[PDB]
Design a protein around this ligand. Structure first.
Ligand SMILES: NC(=O)c1ccc[n+]([C@@H]2O[C@H](COP(=O)([O-])OP(=O)(O)OC[C@H]3O[C@@H](n4cnc5c(N)ncnc54)[C@H](O)[C@@H]3O)[C@@H](O)[C@H]2O)c1
Ligand SMILES: NC(=O)c1ccc[n+]([C@@H]2O[C@H](COP(=O)([O-])OP(=O)(O)OC[C@H]3O[C@@H](n4cnc5c(N)ncnc54)[C@H](O)[C@@H]3O)[C@@H](O)[C@H]2O)c1
Ligand SMILES: NC(=O)c1ccc[n+]([C@@H]2O[C@H](COP(=O)([O-])OP(=O)(O)OC[C@H]3O[C@@H](n4cnc5c(N)ncnc54)[C@H](O)[C@@H]3O)[C@@H](O)[C@H]2O)c1
Ligand SMILES: NC(=O)c1ccc[n+]([C@@H]2O[C@H](COP(=O)([O-])OP(=O)(O)OC[C@H]3O[C@@H](n4cnc5c(N)ncnc54)[C@H](O)[C@@H]3O)[C@@H](O)[C@H]2O)c1
Ligand SMILES: Cc1ncc2c(c1O)C(=O)OC2
Ligand SMILES: Cc1ncc2c(c1O)C(=O)OC2
Ligand SMILES: Cc1ncc2c(c1O)C(=O)OC2
Ligand SMILES: Cc1ncc2c(c1O)C(=O)OC2
Lengths: 247, 247, 247, 247
């Protein structure tokens, strides 16, 4: 019991929403959890709320130097991560005709390229420390649905799934698995503060089970993927959306 | 875990291999487990290997009367199942030119239709007992790979995935989820006694992770799918094959 | 406009609906087309309606003796098929609680097992002649959507996709390709006469493109799959539904 | 004459390889073809290889100014495109430990962001001209396979698939479809000059049908997707790889 005792997990974007919930669950599982977010004040509050097992370290996942500093600090405090959860992203609501190159570049730079930057450093850290590892990246079921008003975001999330599939092949020899989770619409802090909050009616209509998805619905699946129970799973995408789509 | 304390799980085809391991893990999780198999001697041995949480009840999943008797005995003993694992199947090795109608019908009748027979009765039992429930069906990653020497089997397993997707839609309103697992090649009792045993070299070379797949690799994933951690997952297929294919 | 000159194509279930439209297009492409249906009078009428090189031969795809007779007559009339289109199926509307074993068996027997019976005989006929043929099976996008009121049908169509993937592997060495098409809701004769006709409003609203799907939408895709332009495609499923789902 | 008579198709990266083959086939189908490549002299040479129906216009797809100038010229020559084929990309061979941020950014910038830049301008041009349109983007079956030595490329191609699915939803109302093709390994000019040339043994081993994939294998499928026969297909990905993977 406390299956993650002695393990260190980094969760990016963990100041609020799904990321905070993931960090809370991994901490309850026994892990030392690094709560990282570009919002430093938010990260501090999130780590404090989780208690004990959690430490806040601010980072911008799109900034290579910021990420290098993040991992240097983790190495000094813990000896290196065992588990990486790529959760940070911008979740936009943008009409197609408002998707210009500036918007596109920003979404790709954070959501896709930031994910690479963090994964590059994190898996290099696992390997240097001789740790079997787990990479878990939060994508989105919009990749399956073709959801409107998010074109750059859907592209970036498809990139995260592609990256995951290739990464699994590259890292298997190091005993590191790489999987993705595709949440459906979740009632996170960020969604409640955006026009996506108005999408619950349509989404629930398409779900096989009713109710608004919650951050804990995703956190509890990430817990499984971080555990030894998922040791034979790599390169896969697990869709968690009460059945809005079927993968 | 004990997370399944007070729950009842039926595992079909549990005399040996993957089914036995699934039964063993669900019992370790705390469930009362019904070990069912057409091989009554084997079911008895498997239940004895697991201990007091397991009870052997023989059944042929393709025989509606045999299945009715199975569920009547489960109802009398436990008040009804909470969890159904559809694991029973024939795993053939048959060259395409040896796939005649007799062979086709037999594989379809057990692997696909038997799965319906058991699921019909089992989910009706859950509903009658006002139980939230979990249906978990073992398919095969051959559905993704188009593996040779198993044509009727691959068809049947595609049918199980299709059935799972429709069932998730039909049963969501009764708080019952329906998911599938696709194992890759697993060193089960049945595989070891078949020409499929010689596929391990080629499969392991195509895997991202090293090693021959084991029954426990699948059992531990079914544990997750039977748990509350998977409560927001329905209609989905989780591929467990050390990366031979990517889903 | 004559790319199929010299080729012979068999289309099952071709008395009406999608089947007839497929037969009509392949005939326009220049092929000798065998219009086959369990409705013997209907098969004759549709072949006469198409004219060109169309000929009718009645058959029940679920009856191996009937199919044997079908292929004997085809061999005698044409020298054997180059192209097989598995289109015949029963399209039910049945509430889940009305899906009993009798219903399930019938749908699996015709839609899945009938597809095997025809494919067994048809691809054997191709091979006997040394032809680099084409197997194209009509499945359904309900396999992706988990559509309600069709549980046995969705299972059968998943079986057809599984069968297709395995068959591509088995027959590639004989230069025979095997692919599947998944239509969305189509305004066929059969659909117009069923409660499925009422699904058009919901379906069109979920489609990316406007309009009710027509049999010719599917026929024109099957034409491509039967042509040399599709020569490098095998084992694949092409979804044709104006974007209701994304495959 | 000629399915695409009166139509204008732009093919990017068309100086050599698959792009040249696509441009050639669309010209044979009757379209006026804009042969575009970052290699200006290469674009001129390829247009000359096609003949009177081709016009060469140089452009770097990753450069917004270059792409806008490309479309400004097309508008003056033809009144605007009906068909866009996003074919330009870098196809790298790079060991995982050589995948650094500079490499990642370059691949994403050209293969994914360039695809957006061209599609943004191209579909805006279709709409301004009041033309029903077809967008066809060339991805890669590495997205399905998780192919090694190409990690950024696999991510970028996953992005193209995601983008395609969202774009279909955004543009259906304007009667523009958007689909993707995933080629398997193809003996293109570019592959012949790279370490991927050494992959044919392994790839052919996994293929259901034997032989090295050729540019025409892809061109002939793109022809179908550009035609009216594909009018009911949008948001889909068509895999063209002699069965190396099954989609
Ligand atoms: N909520 C949903 O409906 C939904 C659905 C599918 C997928 N997702 C994914 O789940 C993840 C979390 O989503 P959420 O709804 O909880 O988001 P949220 O907006 O509530 O929180 C996102 C967090 O990420 C942080 N962040 C943003 N950019 C960052 C960067 N450059 N570096 C470090 N941190 C950064 C923010 O500060 C914020 O704390 C995201 O990957 C999102 O794409 C969400
Ligand atoms: N082992 C693998 O490589 C592999 C891979 C993918 C999927 N699977 C699936 O996993 C499941 C278990 O596989 P396994 O390798 O452990 O099989 P196995 O051959 O070792 O055991 C199968 C059990 O099912 C029972 N059974 C067969 N027909 C039955 C029927 N009519 N009614 C009741 N019981 C019946 C047998 O008696 C046997 O005890 C099957 O569904 C199989 O299709 C196995
Ligand atoms: N129409 C749709 O919305 C739709 C959607 C997805 C898939 N499909 C598939 O398309 C195919 C054609 O459907 P349709 O709507 O044109 O059907 P339809 O009902 O209009 O026509 C089907 C034809 O098949 C024949 N048939 C039935 N059982 C047969 C058997 N045992 N042997 C030989 N022939 C038999 C019937 O006589 C009929 O002529 C089917 O495979 C169906 O599952 C249809
Ligand atoms: N060849 C394969 O095995 C294979 C497999 C799967 C997918 N693909 C995809 O097919 C497409 C064509 O591949 P190919 O093998 O024919 O490539 P190739 O290398 O032979 O030709 C690529 C062409 O694109 C041009 N190009 C590169 N960057 C450009 C840019 N910034 N702007 C404009 N043009 C640019 C090059 O000048 C070249 O003429 C690519 O999208 C590739 O990813 C190829
Ligand atoms: C189905 C769905 N709807 C809205 C949103 C998402 C989603 O997956 C998402 O990831 O961000 C917003
Ligand atoms: C990859 C693979 N190889 C062999 C077998 C299976 C499989 O999935 C299977 O389910 O039964 C035998
Ligand atoms: C989406 C959808 N709706 C209704 C029907 C089908 C379908 O695919 C089908 O194949 O038969 C009826
Ligand atoms: C299977 C496969 N092998 C090598 C390559 C590709 C591919 O799809 C590709 O797109 O570029 C190189």
């Amino acid at each position: 019991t406390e299956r993650l005792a002695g393990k260190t997990a980094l969760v990016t974007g963990a100041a609020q929403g799904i990321g905070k919930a993931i960090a809370a669950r991994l901490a309850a599982d026994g892990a030392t959890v690094i709560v990282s977010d570009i919002n430093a004040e938010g990260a501090k509050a999130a780590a404090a709320s989780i208690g004990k097992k959690a430490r806040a370290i601010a980072a911008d996942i799109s900034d290579p130097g910021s990420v290098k500093a993040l991992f240097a600090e983790i190495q000094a405090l813990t000896g290196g991560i065992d588990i990486l959860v790529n959760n940070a992203s911008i979740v936009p609501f943008v009409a197609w005709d408002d998707v210009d190159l500036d918007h596109w570049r920003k979404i790709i730079d954070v959501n896709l390229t930031g994910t690479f930057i963090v994964t590059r450093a994190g898996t290099d850290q696992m390997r240097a420390a001789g740790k079997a590892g787990r990479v878990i990246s939060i994508a989105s079921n919009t990749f399956f649905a073709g959801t409107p008003n998010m074109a750059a975001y859907v592209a970036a999330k498809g990139g995260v799934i592609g990256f995951t599939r290739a990464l699994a092949t590259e890292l298997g020899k190091y005993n590191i698995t790489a999987n993705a989770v595709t949440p459906g619409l979740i009632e996170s802090d960020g969604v409640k503060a955006s026009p996506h909050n108005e999408a619950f009616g349509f989404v629930e209509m398409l779900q096989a089970m009713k109710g608004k998805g919650q951050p804990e619905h995703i956190a509890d699946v990430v817990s499984f993927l971080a555990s030894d129970d998922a040791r034979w799973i790599t390169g896969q995408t697990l869709n968690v959306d009460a059945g809005m789509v079927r993968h």
